[PDB]
Structure 1
Amino acid sequence: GRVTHTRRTFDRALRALPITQHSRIWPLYLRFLRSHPLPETAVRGYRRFLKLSPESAEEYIEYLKSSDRLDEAAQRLATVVNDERFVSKAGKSNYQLWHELCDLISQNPDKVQSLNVDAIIRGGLTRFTDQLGKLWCSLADYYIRSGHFEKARDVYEEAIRTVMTVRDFTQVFDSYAQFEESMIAAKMETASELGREEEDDVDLELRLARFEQLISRRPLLLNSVLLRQNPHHVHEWHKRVALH
């Protein structure tokens, strides 16, 4: 009921520096964080700049993520993300993937402004390189939370240009189909550009069908485009097929 016992007891238990008094000092900050985040931030910051351990920032950020103060949790996370003498602080144990998980739970369907979300995706992709998985995820988010004009055009172009795997073509096909009337010059020529997609056995029909069923009126181009996207070897009736 008074901070006097807390402070004096902590100091007297801290007279030695063994693994004793640790889970009485830090859970003291845990139970102090109630209705007062200032002593919580105080213990967190002074601890991350206090007695050495790699578990220090671990317990600090793991106690702070559970409260209404989370940028302080991310601050202890950033202390770990620099760490000044150990890039890998914990071996197989993860801090950066967990930071990416918290960034995912923040870009969860709360901040749907569609800028913080893609920023958090680039932040996770910077903290750790993403082998096509978060790449397809962020490409789909960037094609869905865009518009239909040259904004979606550049979105699809940059996505396909730096893409890693397939179904990115399907993402840009969804974009092109939703925007199939974005200019009164071509009516979203991205449809034909994606009917001309990868040569041998990837989709060869997906973007063409999306363009021909935007709702439906008449493709008049997707047939030629899909049949120009790599039929069988050169000398055959492929020419007659292109002629019909």
Structure 2
Amino acid sequence: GRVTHTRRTFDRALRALPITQHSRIWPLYLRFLRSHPLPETAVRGYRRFLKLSPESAEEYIEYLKSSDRLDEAAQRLATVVNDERFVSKAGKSNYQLWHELCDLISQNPDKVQSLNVDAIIRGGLTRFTDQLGKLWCSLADYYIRSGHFEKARDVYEEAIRTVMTVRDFTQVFDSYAQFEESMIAAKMETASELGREEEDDVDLELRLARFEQLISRRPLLLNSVLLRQNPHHVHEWHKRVALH
């Protein structure tokens, strides 16, 4: 109950520096962390700026990420996301992928301002690339938590420029059907821009039916887009469809 016994214990145990007494000192600071974040914070700073090992900041982060202080946990993770001489601070073990999993845990439906989740997805994609999966999820969340007016059209245009695989046009289709009325001139020309989308056998129907069944009136444009969407090679019934 008094810090004198624990401090003197850890001090006389640090007489040498073999593997022993780490499993005392680290959990000693961990138990001190209750009722005061100061011992855990300063001991974590001293450890991660102290004696040489890969697992020092690992145990510090395992103790600090379960806590109610995430700045200290991601701060150990930042001293790790430098590593200052060693890309593979762990190798096939990943602690930056761990930071990205923490970023997903913070992108969980807690801070829904549509700012921090997308910024954390950009930070996790910037640490290590996330190709079309977390990228498709980040573009989906950015286009879905956004509005309907030209802001959603710009979101879907940039996300199309960055798009990798199919169903990104489906995400832009969702944005368009939700944006059925973004202005009083073309009424979300995104319906046409996405119905005439990529040329052969990909969706051919997604954005068309989106504009068609926003609720329903009559699209009168989805037909022209879809039958103008690359019928078979040049000489065929293609003129008949494009004329009908």
Give me the TM-score of the superposition, normalised by structure 1.
0.99
How far the C-alpha of 1:103 sits from its partner, in A, is: 0.8
Task: State the aligned residue count.
Answer: 244
SS at match of 1:180: coil
How far the C-alpha of 1:235 sits from its partner, in A, is: 0.6
How far the C-alpha of 1:88 sits from its partner, in A, is: 1.2
Question: Which position in structure 2 is the counterpart of 1:203?
Answer: 203
How far the C-alpha of 1:91 sits from its partner, in A, is: 1.3
How far the C-alpha of 1:35 sits from its partner, in A, is: 1.1
How far the C-alpha of 1:37 sits from its partner, in A, is: 0.2
How far the C-alpha of 1:63 sits from its partner, in A, is: 0.7
SS at match of 1:64: helix
Show CA shifts across 1:97-135 (max 9, x none).
Answer: 110001111111000010001000001000110121001
**Structural RMSD (CA):** 0.6
Show CA shifts across 1:113-158 (max 9, x none).
Answer: 1000100000100011012100110011011000001110100000
SS at match of 1:74: helix
Show CA shifts across 1:69-104 (max 9, x none).
Answer: 111000000111101110111110001111000111
How far the C-alpha of 1:233 sits from its partner, in A, is: 0.6
2: CA distance, partners of 1:67 / 1:6:
22
How far the C-alpha of 1:28 sits from its partner, in A, is: 0.5
**Gapped regions of structure 2 (runs ≥ 5):** none
After TM superposition, what 4+ stretches of structure 1 lie above 2 angstroms from structure 2?
none
How far the C-alpha of 1:207 sits from its partner, in A, is: 0.7
SS at match of 1:188: coil
1: CA distance, partners of 2:85 / 2:235:
64
How far the C-alpha of 1:62 sits from its partner, in A, is: 1.1
2: CA distance, partners of 1:49 / 1:135:
35
2: CA distance, partners of 1:237 / 1:49:
74
**Gapped regions of structure 1 (runs ≥ 5):** none
Question: Which position in structure 2 is the counterpart of 1:174?
Answer: 174
The sequence identity of aligned pairs, in percent, is: 100
How far the C-alpha of 1:163 sits from its partner, in A, is: 0.7
2: CA distance, partners of 1:131 / 1:175:
21
How far the C-alpha of 1:206 sits from its partner, in A, is: 1.1
Give me the TM-score of the superposition, normalised by structure 2.
0.99
Superposed counterparts of 1:63-212, under 5 Å? 63-212=63-212
SS at match of 1:233: coil
2: CA distance, partners of 1:162 / 1:106:
24
2: CA distance, partners of 1:73 / 1:206:
44
How far the C-alpha of 1:237 sits from its partner, in A, is: 1.5
Show CA shifts across 1:13-52 (max 9, x none).
Answer: 1101010000100001110110100111010001111101
How far the C-alpha of 1:231 sits from its partner, in A, is: 0.4
